[PDB]
């Protein structure tokens, strides 16, 4: 991500937003002493393709008279649209924790 | 002179307690508790010289495991730890860990004693954890108490849900922005330990901290609904419910609708009124903390194999009080041996639909195949039909029986009672061995590969046999054939 | 902002008056203060219950008047304002404790540890070289009960009465308990515990919300101003068992055309779990208002809700000298079966199946032992009177209708769907009742195989899938689809049922509305003369006793006989007998089911006559009412 100081203009690039959308603290420019009011630059930041599919154990594993667990399962880059709904499937990957946002 | 340790508000010494207990586990053996359990006179001595914990202690390291389950009336048996019993049944959190300590010292010390050659990183690593059960009487959900509150108590109860398992932090993970300097602290009762600035003199940036999720370190936790179990209800009331926390190992220890004696503290904890405010409503969330779940060769294949008069005697028996119809136990009796299952694919299972009257024992056959099998489910054909026997969209995918039974049998009782559409699923169930649906964006081919055994009802009364009896049944002859 | 005015009540001499009540008053009536031994209980830690008696300040107020002074009324200021003389008789009680007379069992109490740091704390502090709340070191709980038969707490007042000048007083309440909630700890004092300065506070609630202390307020805590952060200890707090419930209008006291009213009642320590959903109650409680917090308090404003936390609560609910009394009478199934409903006449047979349904049959260990018994009949001949009558005579029954089931519904005190029984629930070890069986649900039509096979209530709703207890005997009745009986039509294809059910069912009655005219006559006098004079009428026979029957039908349930083996071959050659009669309109063949039924009416006359043995002639009465059966399927 990359955001404008609203009073002198000045530039930060490369903010990295790791599960809620976060802004610069600390204008760079020494003269100006911003700390709130960022906008954000819609061209220079990056951005990256996301998919969410949600998971569940299949019926060879599911023991007597249980509901089927459920996990959700992060597609990032040109993973997207890889897996389709209803399918018996591998993904091997990182487990992750999300927090509250 | 030496600032010794006293558990809160209780005038007992910590030194005390992890000498009473230390000595306990290395010098109870069994003979003691054979004393005085009143067993003196059915002793097995060979059993009882050798030293009944160490021995343990001994298989834990080898097996693996670090979990050492215990029974609290050895501490009435031993005499050091009998006032420590008393401590179980008064203040258990804090005796409790006092007992895993001394149980890693324990490892520590028999490493260290005979000078066995084992490395003290294997052994320092594993986090040991006791578990006690058989601490006392068994004690009633409605003659629960707030006289109960810390304390160590039994509850049995059956599983009415089972939640996925909740990350609960152990160790918090701190960053600096600034200097990156990778530092961690300890959470206590679910406060964070957080720095204002960094432990380095170098920076010591103030406001710099940064809480990094995935790198710190988690320890499961399961809540389970517990259900009194119905042998000892009131007859007035439903049973009661109520939360079991389970941590750690414990955690998918206890499955679905089985009969469980659960042993652990009853804690109450305040519930927050509001979600940002500090406000705690007047009533509290009781819960019970656990600390244990108590459940509930091929030589014998072969010397029947060799035996010549085995057909008759499995034949007797699957149905014992059903004298006549041997041929129908035979076809059932095939039925759970079937045939192998062939790919290049043909089924191997055969399918039996029994006609008679509903008068006539044949629930009871369905009952007896059922608990005879090891896959295999029990289903009406009045309870379920639609599109319920077979894989349904719920809430997720709930399938029915007919694929959750891979290999085993599906035994259906009254199966008249079929619909048009559960026709049409179990024409793909028996030809193709294998369910689809196309529901709400989800394509799903799964293999059914399930050996039917159905019971009809002919309408009304008996039928002559003079004309024949396939028209009287209501089934479609697709599904006859 | 809180201008003052002048009452003329006195505190201090009414708190005189009970200090002086406390250990003058004794009773002597029935043949050292009473209130004394039991404090001294208190102090022995014998009982935890406490309970004031209105009629005993009563009487010692006008033991003042014998003795020619006069007190303050105390009666009436109890009866005026109790929540404030709750306090005021704790207050008394804990300036007037007794000694400890037995082992005090010091290890168990850890408060006293605490509060002995504590005096060592403020011994050391104050050197130089109240400190706890009341309701802490309190280990009784106080009741009040109500003066009678001597006044507004006297009179029982119904729901709708009680008005909002009744808040603040003891009042008393005449309802039935709907919804029950579990048992669940309320707190009194929060202890809290400082790290740094390793002191105490303690927080007094007396509200449905609190708030935490975060920062210790402690003298030595902030004479050096550290910032101890305070921790919450549930070992130091006391608790309370709180539970609430409510209680409903009686149908007999809401006027015509209006919805009974619910009242909340809150039940605080020892009085815990006495309440029973389904029960109908006194409970004589201080009548409360409950005060919201924060912005509920600010948008509702004055209009604020109420409660009743109770103080009393009252069940409005030899024999074997009588069992032989009754076996000395003589024709115990006849007087029990004409005894039983005594509006309808005649009917002799069926009433005796209707009375061996509350006999039932023995158990073993696993084969049902239950009877059930349907009453397939003409309409017009009296089925609800009958379902009505056998829900009266025996206890732990209900009526219902199949227009019936058990179900967990929505809206609970909690979000969660609570586990509310259905019909075949709180029938269970008892009688259900079904009313038109023709015209029931399919759920049901499927539910009641489970009822009888199986003998439990499985619902699997919104995740949760339980087996709830039904050990139910089952009572039906079933008109058939059309009113008359013709031997044009199948006795099946009349009733519409399936045969799966009668396959397991055991013992259809059919009685007919046949016209005689002896026989009108002879129920037409009846009928008219129950219309004559006040209630039931006279019986012209040994008449009715409708306390009688609940003990000795229970004494039945207790034998339990065991019968014998050339008994059984009897048995066998009749049922070979009734499988020769099913080679020989209606189908109805007898079955091993039928068998078994056969066997239930064999001991439940065995029951009756209180027998070791099953006799042969009981055992062919049985299939001499099996033919009545028989007959009954026939006409
Ligand atoms: N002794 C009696 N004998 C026959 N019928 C009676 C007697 N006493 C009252 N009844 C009538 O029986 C009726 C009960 O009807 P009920 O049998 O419930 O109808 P249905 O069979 O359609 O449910 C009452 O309305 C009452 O008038
Ligand atoms: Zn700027
Ligand atoms: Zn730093
Ligand atoms: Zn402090």
């Known amino acids: 991500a990359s955001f404008t100081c609203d009073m002198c203009r000045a530039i930060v690039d490369n903010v990295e937003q790791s599960f809620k959308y976060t802004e610069p603290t600390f204008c760079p420019n020494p003269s100006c002493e911003n700390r709130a009011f960022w906008t954000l630059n819609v061209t220079r930041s990056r951005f990256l393709d996301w998919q969410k599919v949600r998971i569940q154990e299949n019926a060879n594993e599911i023991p007597t008279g249980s509901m089927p667990r459920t996990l959700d399962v992060i597609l990032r880059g040109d993973s997207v649209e890889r897996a389709k709904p209803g399918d018996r499937c591998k993904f091997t990957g990182v487990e992750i924790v999300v927090p509250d946002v | ?481 | 902002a809180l201008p003052s005015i002048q009452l003329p009540v006195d505190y201090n001499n009414l708190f005189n008056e009970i200090t002086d009540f406390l250990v003058t008053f004794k009773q002597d009536t029935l043949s050292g203060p009473k209130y004394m031994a039991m404090l001294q209980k208190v102090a022995n830690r014998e009982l935890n219950s406490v309970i004031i008696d209105l009629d005993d300040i009563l009487q010692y107020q006008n033991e003042k008047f014998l003795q020619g002074t006069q007190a303050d009324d105390l009666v009436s200021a109890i009866q005026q304002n109790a929540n404030h003389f709750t306090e005021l008789f704790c207050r008394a009680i804990d300036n007037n404790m007794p000694l400890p007379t037995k082992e005090i069992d010091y290890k168990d109490d850890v408060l006293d540890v605490i509060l002995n740091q504590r005096r060592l704390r403020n011994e050391r502090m104050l050197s130089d070289r109240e400190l706890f709340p009341p309701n802490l070191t309190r280990r009784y709980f106080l009741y009040f009960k109500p003066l009678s038969q001597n006044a507004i707490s006297s009179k029982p007042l119904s729901v709708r009465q009680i008005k909002g000048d009744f808040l603040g007083q003891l009042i008393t309440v005449r309802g039935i308990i709907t919804r029950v909630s579990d048992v669940k700890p309320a707190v009194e004092v929060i202890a809290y515990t400082c790290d740094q300065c390793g002191y105490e506070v303690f927080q007094e609630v007396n509200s449905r919300t609190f708030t935490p202390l975060s920062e210790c307020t402690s003298e030595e805590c902030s004479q050096n101003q550290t910032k101890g952060q305070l921790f919450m200890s549930t070992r130091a707090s006391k608790f309370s068992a709180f539970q609430e419930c409510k209680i409903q209008e009686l149908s007999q006291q809401v006027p015509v055309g209006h919805i009974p009213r619910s009242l909340n009642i809150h039940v605080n320590g020892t009085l815990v779990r006495s309440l029973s959903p389904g029960d109908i109650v006194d409970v004589t409680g201080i009548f409360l208002p409950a005060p919201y917090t924060g912005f509920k308090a600010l948008k509702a404003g004055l209009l604020t809700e109420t409660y009743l936390e109770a103080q009393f609560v009252r069940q409005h609910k030899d024999v074997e000298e009588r069992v032989m009394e009754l076996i000395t009478s003589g024709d115990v199934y006849n007087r029990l079966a004409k005894s039983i409903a005594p509006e309808i006449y005649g009917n002799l047979d069926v009433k005796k199946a209707l009375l061996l349904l509350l006999v039932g049959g023995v158990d073993k260990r696993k084969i049902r032992g239950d009877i059930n018994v349907c009453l397939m009949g003409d309409p017009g001949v009296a089925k609800s009177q009958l379902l009505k009558a056998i829900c009266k005579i025996s206890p732990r029954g209900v009526y219902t209708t199949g227009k019936l089931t058990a179900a967990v519904m929505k809206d609970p005190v909690t979000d969660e769907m609570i586990l509310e029984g259905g019909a075949l629930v709180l029938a269970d070890n008892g009688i259900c009742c079904i009313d038109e069986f023709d015209k029931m649900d399919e759920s049901d039509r499927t539910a009641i195989h489970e009822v009888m096979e199986q003998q439990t209530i499985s619902i699997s709703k919104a995740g949760i899938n339980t087996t709830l207890n039904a050990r139910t005997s089952i009572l039906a009745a079933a008109n058939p689809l059309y009113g008359r009986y013709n031997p044009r039509l199948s006795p099946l294809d009349n009733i519409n049922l399936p045969a799966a059910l009668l396959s397991r069912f055991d013992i259809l009655f059919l009685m007919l509305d046949i016209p005689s005219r002896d026989d009108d006559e002879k129920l037409a006098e009846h009928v008219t003369y129950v219309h004559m004079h006040n209630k039931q009428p006279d019986l012209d026979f040994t008449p009715v006793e409708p306390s009688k029957m609940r003990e000795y039908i229970a004494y039945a349930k207790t034998k339990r006989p065991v019968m014998s083996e050339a008994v059984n071959d009897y048995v066998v050659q009749a049922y070979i007998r009734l499988r020769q009669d099913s080679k020989r309109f209606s189908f109805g063949q007898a079955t091993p089911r039928t068998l078994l039924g056969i066997i239930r009416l064999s001991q439940a006359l065995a029951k009756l006559r209180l027998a070791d043995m099953v006799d042969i002639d009981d055992v062919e009465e049985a299939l001499r009412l099996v033919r009545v059966s028989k007959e009954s399927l026939y006409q």
């Open chain 2, 1 to 481: 002179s030496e600032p010794l340790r006293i558990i809160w508000g209780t005038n007992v010494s910590i030194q005390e307690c992890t000498t009473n207990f230390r000595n306990f586990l290395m010098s109870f053996k069994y003979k003691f508790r054979k004393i005085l359990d009143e067993r003196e006179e059915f002793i097995n001595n060979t059993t009882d010289e050798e030293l009944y914990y160490i021995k343990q202690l001994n298989e834990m390291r080898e097996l693996g495991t670090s979990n050492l389950n215990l029974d609290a009336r050895n501490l009435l048996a031993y005499k050091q730890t009998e006032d420590l019993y008393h401590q179980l049944l008064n203040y258990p959190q804090e005796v409790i860990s006092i007992m895993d300590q001394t149980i890693k010292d324990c490892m520590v010390s028999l490493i260290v004693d005979n000078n066995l050659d084992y490395d003290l990183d294997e052994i320092e690593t594993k986090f040991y954890k006791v578990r006690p059960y058989n601490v006392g009487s068994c004690k009633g959900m409605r003659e629960l108490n707030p006289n109960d509150i810390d304390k160590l108590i039994n509850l049995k109860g059956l599983v009415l849900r089972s939640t996925p398992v909740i990350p609960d932090m152990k160790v918090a993970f701190f960053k600096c922005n600034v200097c990156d300097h990778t530092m961690a602290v300890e959470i206590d009762r679910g406060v964070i330990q957080e720095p204002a600035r960094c432990e380095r003199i170098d920076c010591n940036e103030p406001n710099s901290m940064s809480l990094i999720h995935n790198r710190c370190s988690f320890a499961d936790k399961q809540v389970i609904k517990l259900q009194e179990t119905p042998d000892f209800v009131p007859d007035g009331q439903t049973p009661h419910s109520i939360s079991l926390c389970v941590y750690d190992e414990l955690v998918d220890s206890c499955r679905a609708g089985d009969r469980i004696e659960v042993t652990g503290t009853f804690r109450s904890i305040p519930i927050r009124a509001n979600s940002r405010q500090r406000v705690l409503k007047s009533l509290y969330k009781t819960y019970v903390d656990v600390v244990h779940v108590k459940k509930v060769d091929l030589a014998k294949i072969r010397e029947v194999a060799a035996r010549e008069d085995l057909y008759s005697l499995l034949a007797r028996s699957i149905a014992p009080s059903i004298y006549e119809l041997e041929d129908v136990k035979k076809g059932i009796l095939l039925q759970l041996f079937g045939g192998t299952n062939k790919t290049f694919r043909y089924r191997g299972d055969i399918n039996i639909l029994l006609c008679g009257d509903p008068s006539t024992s044949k629930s009871q056959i369905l009952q007896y195949v059922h608990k005879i099998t090891p896959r295999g489910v029990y289903t009406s054909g009045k309870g379920s039909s639609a599109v319920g026997l077979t894989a349904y969209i719920t809430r997720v995918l709930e399938s029915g029986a007919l694929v959750l039974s891979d290999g085993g049998v599906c035994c259906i009782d009254e199966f008249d009672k079929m619909s048009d559409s559960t026709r049409s699923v179990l024409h793909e169930v028996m030809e193709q061995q294998t369910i689809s649906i196309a529901k709400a964006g989800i394509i799903t081919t799964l293999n059914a590969r399930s050996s039917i055994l159905a019971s009809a009802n002919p309408i009304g009364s008996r039928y002559n046999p003079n004309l024949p009896v396939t028209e009287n049944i209501d089934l479609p002859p697709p599904l006859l054939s």
